[PDB]
Design a protein around this ligand. Structure first.
Ligand code: BCL
Ligand code: BCL
Ligand code: BCL
Ligand code: BCL
Ligand SMILES: CC[C@H]1c2cc3[nH]c4c(c3C)C(=O)[C@H](C(=O)OC)c4c3nc(cc4[nH]c(cc(n2)[C@@H]1C)c(C(C)=O)c4C)[C@@H](C)[C@@H]3CCC(=O)OC/C=C(/C)CCC[C@@H](C)CCC[C@@H](C)CCCC(C)C
Ligand SMILES: CC[C@H]1c2cc3[nH]c4c(c3C)C(=O)[C@H](C(=O)OC)c4c3nc(cc4[nH]c(cc(n2)[C@@H]1C)c(C(C)=O)c4C)[C@@H](C)[C@@H]3CCC(=O)OC/C=C(\C)CCC[C@H](C)CCC[C@H](C)CCCC(C)C
Ligand SMILES: COC1=C(OC)C(=O)C(C/C=C(\C)CC/C=C(\C)CC/C=C(\C)CC/C=C(\C)CC/C=C(\C)CC/C=C(\C)CC/C=C(\C)CC/C=C(\C)CC/C=C(\C)CCC=C(C)C)=C(C)C1=O
Ligand SMILES: COC1=C(OC)C(=O)C(C/C=C(\C)CC/C=C(\C)CC/C=C(\C)CC/C=C(\C)CC/C=C(\C)CC/C=C(\C)CC/C=C(\C)CC/C=C(\C)CC/C=C(\C)CCC=C(C)C)=C(C)C1=O
Ligand SMILES: COC(C)(C)C/C=C/C(C)=C/C=C/C(C)=C/C=C/C(C)=C\C=C\C=C(C)\C=C\C=C(/C)CC/C=C(\C)CCC=C(C)C
Ligand SMILES: CCCCCCCCCCCC[N+](C)(C)[O-]
Ligand SMILES: CCCCCCCCCCCC[N+](C)(C)[O-]
Ligand SMILES: CCCCCCCCCCCC[N+](C)(C)[O-]
Ligand SMILES: CCCCCCCCCCCC[N+](C)(C)[O-]
Ligand SMILES: [Fe+2]
Lengths: 246, 281, 299
């Protein structure tokens, strides 16, 4: 029966596709490791895929995966139990050490370029023609932290050019310097911009950028990682929803 | 075993219940209070199903079927082998599904990410509950719910459908279907676009987002953008399940006849209702 | 902030895009910006590329639509009020069985259907060539053309390949809103309930699965947009904490995960399998299997 042969074949095909799909998704993170960093005995039933090479744009190099794990910076965490499967507590300040919800990856310390070779992200003040087209313009608004204290003011928007979208808000602190706040971690309101992940006192700690006109991938990650980590690590200083409605 | 970049993320915190008591992993799996609650519900529920198989007299996966209580029982309880087992299993399923979502929430907290995933999953739970709890209650009987059987639940779809003629005529069902199709269309487009940029013609540098914008713009005169495409995918798939739950919640509660007849309201509109000609004149 | 809608829209000069090997002469000018669209995605409309293939496709496509419409006006007796009240009831049906695969059917009894179909045939295929060539001019992979082929396969099976194998145009789908629905139901009834068709069941699996996976993927990406997760190509070339957290959410949740590039392979196949298995299930219906219940009984 032709139909029976078809269904029979499909399942063989499907099992093979899944096999193929699973291996392709092992180009990052594998081989697996034991918590001490050594190769774990059980790697699973799927073998690592054959390497492939990505040729990066504007000659920024190549990427071959799978390959040796790129993470080699110190991880400020210590075992909490003798057996495997347990948490690892931060040895110092997780926010400053970059661990847990505050982790960041050592990405290439260069800004991302668009297809025309120009910086993909730019302060709006320096993006010819870019303007706020709709919604409440946050520029000029005071920025509030979860402790309900003012942490600074919005002095510009950093736009993704190709996507024509707002990626970060540039906030000036009391000392006159500025920090980049992830756009999807702020709430723009009528009289101000509210940041739930951070208490005013933690803004100064937000990693800074070398050049004030651009931001690199490495910096993006440090900024994004730090801001998110605040949700867990700044909770003690985060005022309730009640005091907020006041 | 951990991914080569995982350790720095396995820190304490994020749990919603039990402090650090259940804050640990088993292999790649994270546990937490809701991790055990899920195991509990899933274990018991699977056990009660197996028992229903025993009472039914079969171990065949293609034949095992747990039916809800007959219309007689209305919304009351019922003997285990005659609808009661289905009632308890349903509770275990609801409890396991909700626990899985709450467990996903603790996972979100430990990793510092948004809560979109469990939120979206709740739509699925809401669609399940709509068929097994919400519609049966508005209709006055657990009998109106579907059976837990691989083929029997399809019989239930079939019979329920034809109870109103060709179910295609359900207007809410039409909208849901459109979202399901549009969704699969968008899913295919999204995967292909990204893949086509990451894997350009052999020997070429990776394409960029600009190339992605240019491809679609050249093709259909519009590019929704990376953020928008992920917003659309979630929108389409959530809208499909929502209009699914809606198309059923109204069937048998506020609409009882053949769905095809519903469309007559538009046809009977006074200004054209009696003009001879066409299909309806 | 759930990032479902943008809080503030930003806009720069019209973006003309990449050139690569594209013939700029065939590229129109930028269209209007839509603040409305801008809340959800890009506000920019256009520009669009329209070479000969594109003009051909659009022309045929319109001729297809217009052919169906003229017949609808005819069925309405050219009365505007009737056209609107019975719009979903009109239908352009294919030739009766008596005509087999011939092109001799009278205009009002099949010929118009065939003409409309010829225009649709040309429209879709030239549009397919277009998905391939627009990617080629940009040096991109041909994934879109291949995925599109899968959908074309179900379409082809429904109005061309199966009808031919069956021996008559009468087997094809009629051009009408409700009529194509009646055809679909009838098709199941005539083949002994499609729920017993194994490929129809798989197709459903992938359709449900496509909503499952896109809800999963869309929610995941949004959940990590706080770290620039949407910059997927960027995360593929230089993995960031967004890609790592995304992967760990799923690894911790269900025991396994994907990569920023790999997840899109899972996605394109999940979707492509919908119509791929679907087309197979329909092609076998009436050519190899008359009744799925019956066939199911011997398997
Ligand atoms: C095998 C499945 C059946 C079928 C079963 C159904 C059912 C069931 C429904 C539709 C519905 C629709 N069908 Mg149909 N439909 C079929 C084949 C087709 C073909 C074709 C092959 O050329 C076309 C153009 C359509 C088009 C349509 C749209 C008018 C409408 C919305 C679908 C959608 O998500 O569009 C997305 C479009 C873009 C993203 C562009 N159908 C085949 C024959 N179709 C829905 C509706 O409301 O119908 C009145 C609906 O409920
Ligand atoms: C002859 C039959 C009738 C008909 C009768 C009905 C009836 C009756 C119903 C539908 C429903 C639906 N119909 Mg119909 N339908 C017909 C023809 C069609 C056609 C077509 C091409 O012709 C299409 C595309 C559809 C499409 C649809 C979908 C929109 C909808 C089902 C999706 C849904 O609600 O998911 C909802 C999602 C869920 C239910 C998922 C819940 C998942 C839970 C939360 C998690 C499970 C976890 C699991 C147990 C653990 C597994 C183990 C792990 C893997 C390890 N119908 C014909 C005309 N249809 C249904 C609907 O709207 O339902 C609300 C419905 O009830
Ligand atoms: C409103 C829609 C109708 C409905 C209409 C249909 C139709 C029509 C079809 C199915 C089909 C299937 N349905 Mg159903 N189905 C309904 C509700 C459910 C529920 C539930 C808790 O609500 C579950 C678990 C299922 C599960 C299933 C799968 C066994 C099967 C194909 C997988 C698929 O599409 O996956 C989408 C999800 C994934 C791909 C993720 C992986 C999920 C795995 C595959 C599900 C395991 C289910 C398992 C056998 C149940 C045992 C659990 C153990 C006891 C713990 N249905 C409701 C009542 N269903 C298809 C089939 O072939 O049926 C025989 C089919 O054609
Ligand atoms: C009573 C009716 C029967 C039934 C009869 C059928 C029949 C008959 C068929 C399906 C098919 C399908 N059924 Mg069913 N089905 C039933 C019940 C169900 C239920 C349920 C109860 O829950 C579900 C979930 C499904 C689900 C499905 C899908 C998996 C599958 C369609 C995918 C699709 O739409 O591709 C849509 C994609 C296409 C049609 C591709 C072609 C598109 C072309 C290329 C584009 C043309 C564009 C055009 C020019 C116009 C341009 C528009 C402008 C730009 C705006 N069926 C009941 C039992 N079903 C189909 C299938 O594959 O079955 C195996 C099918 O043929
Ligand atoms: C917008 C809605 C769409 C959606 C979204 C969605 N689904 C999700 C998620 C999201 C966002 C998850 O995060 C979660 C996930 O972890 O995915 C891997 C999930 C998930 N969607 C699943 C299935 C699923 N989703 C479906 C649909 C959809 N999911 C929608 C299209 C379907 C169908 C029928 O279309 C199915 C079968 C699970 C694989 C997974 C959630 C896993 C889970 O809850 O595990 C809990 C524990 C168990 C092993 C359960 C034991 C249950 C027993 C107590 C009882 C028996 C169940 C009985 C009621 C079934 C009867 C069977 C018959 C009908 C055959
Ligand atoms: C894997 C299967 C899924 C899929 C994929 C898919 N569809 C596709 C593609 C892909 C990968 C394209 O590349 C192509 C596209 O151009 O996307 C915007 C397309 C496409 N899918 C379309 C429709 C469509 N796809 C559908 C379904 C599906 N497409 C599946 C769910 C459906 C249904 C019934 O569910 C429809 C109605 C078209 C919008 C588009 C192909 C355009 C085309 O052929 O145009 C020819 C005609 C004209 C130029 C003008 C006609 C004039 C009108 C006024 C009438
Ligand atoms: C990165 O993109 C995208 C995806 O990811 C891969 C997607 O999945 C989807 C999802 C897909 C769908 C919803 C269905 C498919 C969509 C369509 C078939 C059409 C949608 C089109 C539009 C909204 C707008 C088209 C606009 C045009 C043609 C305006 C340009 C006009 C001009 C007149 C040119 C100006 C001037 C002159 C003088 C003439 C010369 C979309 C939209 C997407 O965009
Ligand atoms: C960029 O981001 C993303 C990731 O990271 C890079 C991801 O991994 C994922 C996750 C997705 C995948 C790995 C693809 C495969 C997933 C599916 C095809 C969906 C259906 C899922 C299943 C059948 C598995 C269900 C398993 C469960 C519930 C656990 C069972 C457990 C036992 C103990 C027995 C997504 C969506 C994502 O967007
Ligand atoms: C003109 O009137 C004004 C108002 C402008 C416009 C009015 C137009 C209107 C109201 C148009 C309405 C159109 C509708 C409702 C279309 C609906 C289509 C539907 C519902 C479903 C489509 C299913 C069609 C399929 C599966 C078609 C498949 C076709 C093929 C596979 C190609 C077949 C080709 C053939 C037979 C030609 C053979 C010849 C050769 C050599 C290639
Ligand atoms: C619906 C089928 C989708 C499931 C495909 C199964 C993938 C299993 C992958 C196992 C990977 C295990 N691990 C931890 C060792 O990486
Ligand atoms: C292709 C999808 C088109 C979606 C259009 C969506 C419009 C919704 C706009 C809501 C914006 C609300 N507001 C005030 C917060 O900006
Ligand atoms: C008849 C339809 C069959 C089409 C199957 C198309 C699957 C799309 C696969 C995308 C990956 C393509 N590839 C070769 C470039 O890797
Ligand atoms: C990419 C994931 C592929 C696997 C999707 C899971 C499909 C399970 C389908 C069950 C349908 C069974 N059958 C033969 C009765 O139709
Ligand atoms: Fe994506």
């Amino acid at each position: 029966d032709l139909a029976s042969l078809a269904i029979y074949s499909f399942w063989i095909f499907l099992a093979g596709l899944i096999y193929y799909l699973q291996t392709e998704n092992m180009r990052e993170g594998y081989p697996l490791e034991n918590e001490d960093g050594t190769p774990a005995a059980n790697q699973g039933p799927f073998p690592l895929p054959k390497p492939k090479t990505f040729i990066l744009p504007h000659g920024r190099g190549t990427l071959t995966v799978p390959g040796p794990e790129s993470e080699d910076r110190p991880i400020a965490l210590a075992r909490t139990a003798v057996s495997e499967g347990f948490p690892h507590a931060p040895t110092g300040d997780p926010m400053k050490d970059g661990v847990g919800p505050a982790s960041w990856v050592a990405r290439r310390d260069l800004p991302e370029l668009d297809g025309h070779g120009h910086n993909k992200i730019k302060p709006m003040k320096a993006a010819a023609g870019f303007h706020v087209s709709a919604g409440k313009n946050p520029i000029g608004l005071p920025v509030r932290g979860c402790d309900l204290e003012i942490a600074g003011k919005v002095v510009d928007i950093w736009v993704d050019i190709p996507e024509q979208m707002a990626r970060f808000l540039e906030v000036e602190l009391k000392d006159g310097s500025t920090r980049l706040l992830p756009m999807q971690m702020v709430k723009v309101q009528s009289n101000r911009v509210h940041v739930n992940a951070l208490s005013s006192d933690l803004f100064a700690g937000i990693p800074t950028i070398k050049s004030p006109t651009e931001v690199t991938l490495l910096e993006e990650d440090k900024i994004c990682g730090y801001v998110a980590g605040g949700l867990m690590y700044a909770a003690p200083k985060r005022k309730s929803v009640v005091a907020a409605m006041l | 075993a951990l991914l080569s970049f995982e350790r720095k993320y396995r820190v304490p915190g994020g749990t919603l219940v039990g402090g650090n008591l259940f804050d640990f992993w088993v292999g790649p799996f994270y546990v937490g209070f809701f991790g055990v609650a899920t195991f509990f519900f899933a274990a018991l529920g699977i056990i009660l199903i197996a028992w229903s198989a025993v009472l039914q007299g079969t171990w065949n996966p293609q034949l095992i079927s747990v039916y809800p209580p007959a219309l007689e029982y209305g919304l009351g309880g019922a003997p285990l082998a005659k609808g009661g087992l289905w009632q308890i299993i349903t509770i275990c399923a609801t409890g396991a599904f909700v626990s899985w979502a709450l467990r996903e929430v603790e996972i979100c907290r430990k990793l510092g990410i948004g809560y979109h995933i469990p939120f979206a999953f709740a739509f699925a739970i809401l669609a399940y509950l709509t068929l097994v709890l919400f519609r049966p209650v508005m209709m006055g009987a657990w009998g109106y719910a579907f059976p837990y059987g691989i083929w029997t639940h399809l019989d239930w779809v079939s019979n329920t459908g034809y109870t109103y003629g060709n179910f295609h005529y359900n207007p809410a069902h039409m909208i849901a279907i459109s979202f399901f199709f549009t969704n699969a269309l968008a899913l295919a487009l999204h995967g292909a676009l990204v893949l086509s940029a990451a894997n350009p013609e052999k020997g070429k540098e990776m394409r960029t987002p600009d190339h992605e914008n240019t491809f679609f713009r050249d093709l259909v005169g519009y590019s929704i953008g990376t953020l928008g495409i992920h917003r659309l995918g979630l929108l389409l798939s959530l809208s499909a399940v929502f209009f699914s739950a809606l198309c059923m919640i109204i069937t048998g509660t506020i609409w009882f006849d053949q769905w095809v007849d519903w469309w007559q309201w538009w046809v009977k509109l006074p200004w054209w209702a009696n003009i001879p000609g066409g299909i309806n004149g | 902030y759930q990032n479902i809608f943008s809080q503030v829209q930003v806009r720069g000069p019209a973006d003309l895009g990449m050139t690569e090997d594209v013939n700029l002469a065939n590229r129109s000018g930028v269209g209007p910006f839509s603040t409305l669209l801008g809340w959800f995605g890009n506000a920019q409309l256009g520009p669009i590329y329209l070479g000969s293939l594109g003009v051909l496709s659009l022309f045929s496509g319109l001729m297809w639509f217009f052919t169906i419409g003229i017949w609808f006006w005819y069925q309405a007796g050219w009365n505007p009020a009737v056209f609107l009240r019975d719009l979903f009831f009109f239908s352009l049906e294919p030739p009766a069985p008596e005509y087999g695969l011939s092109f001799a059917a009278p205009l009002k009894e099949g010929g118009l259907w065939l003409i409309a179909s010829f225009f649709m045939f040309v429209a879709v295929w030239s549009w397919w060539g277009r998905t391939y060539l627009r990617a080629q001019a940009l040096g991109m992979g041909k994934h879109t053309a291949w995925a599109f082929l899968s959908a074309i396969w179900l379409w082809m099976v429904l109005g061309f390949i199966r009808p031919i194998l069956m021996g008559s145009w009468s087997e094809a789908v009629p051009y009408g809103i409700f009529s194509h629905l009646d055809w679909t139901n009838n098709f199941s009834l005539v083949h002994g309930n499609l729920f017993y068709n194994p490929f129809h069941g798989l197709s459903i699996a992938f359709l449900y699965g496509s909503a499952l996976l896109f809800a999963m993927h869309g929610a995941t990406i949004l959940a990590v947009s706080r770290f620039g997760g949407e910059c997927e190509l960027e995360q593929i070339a230089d993995r960031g904490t967004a890609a790592e957290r995304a992967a760990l959410f799923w690894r911790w949740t269900m025991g396994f995960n994907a990569t920023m590039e790999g997840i899109h392979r899972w996605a394109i196949w999940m979707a492509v399998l919908v119509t791929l298995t679907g087309g197979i299930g329909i092609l076998l219906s009436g050519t190899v299997v008359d009744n799925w219940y019956v066939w199911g009984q011997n398997h």
